[PDB]
Amino acid sequence: HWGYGKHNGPEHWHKDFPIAKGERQSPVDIDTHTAKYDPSLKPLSVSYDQATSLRILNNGHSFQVTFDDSQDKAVLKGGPLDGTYRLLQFHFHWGSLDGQGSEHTVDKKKYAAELHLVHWNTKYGDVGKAVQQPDGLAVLGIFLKVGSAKPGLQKVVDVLDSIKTEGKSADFTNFDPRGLLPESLDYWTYPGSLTTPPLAECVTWIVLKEPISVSSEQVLKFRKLNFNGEGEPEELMVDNWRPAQPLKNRQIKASFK
């Protein structure tokens, strides 16, 4: 099975998922001087007030918080998007040290972690159908740097003890994802892919320019999770990030000058 180790990591994934060498793979380096300000880009609309979180789960490659996506409760609209995208889950990528962990980079700079809020286009009816469409998903990416604590993250951090190993889940209701967002919704956008297998090329990426700050104690909690299941040799869930992929025939657009 795929993972992030020497023998099953990102350099291996193309064997089971040949699209790994495709024309619109993610993540990418965001060269801030080459990204073009697009005045026609609209402001992002993040409507999370009615979000209904359900569970938190260790899926063996990250931990994710899942939401009720059976109605338009928490949706992403506007920005570069046509139509309405429902929030399904969020998860993180992080490092073993504070100088690595993000998937996207900014002028080659790596952040300590990266939050992905995953939304799917409601015109395709279900997320399984959406991942087979070039505009099926919209992922909101938010960088994490280490500094001051993020109060809105603490509820997540405090439950990680209970989902240490692959396959464990817990109730995680009434979690408000608005508490994870930075002040500014200024963003970069480009067409890409899932950054985990099956690496489907169905994602409009929206990467916020402003990172959030989390504390060292908070990120330390991430690094105590485990890739392995209960009872197997302990392998810390760290460095669960895919490196930057070739930009190829793509332009990154900026909503801001």
Q: Which residues are annotated as catalytic?
A: 61
Question: CA 127, CA 13: separation in Å to the nearest integer?
Answer: 22
CB of 89 to Zn ion, least distance (A): 10
Binding residues with Zn ion: total (CB under 5 A) = 1
**Identity of the residue, 116 or 119, whose beta carbon is nearer to Zn ion in the bound complex:** 116
**Is residue 93 part of an annotated ligand binding site?**
yes
Taking the CA atoms of residue 141, residue 146, residue 148 and residue 152 in that order, the dihedral angle to the nearest 10 degrees is 30
Contact region with Zn ion (CB under 5 A), list: 10-18, 78-86, 111-119, 203-211? 111-119
Smallest distance, Zn ion to C-beta of residue 116, A: 4
| Contacts with Zn ion, 18-57, as mask; x by CB under 5 A | ----------------------------------------
Count of CB atoms within 10 A of residue 83's CB?
12
CA dist 204 and 196 (Å) reads: 15
DSSP-derived pairing of the beta strands 137-146 and 212-214? parallel
Residue 61 binds to Zn ion (criterion: CB under 5 A): no
Neighbours of 168 (CB within 10 A): 18
Residue 159 host element (H or E): helix 154-159
24, 86, 104, 116: which one contacts Zn ion (CB under 5 A)? 116
The contact set with Zn ion (CB under 5 A) reads: 116
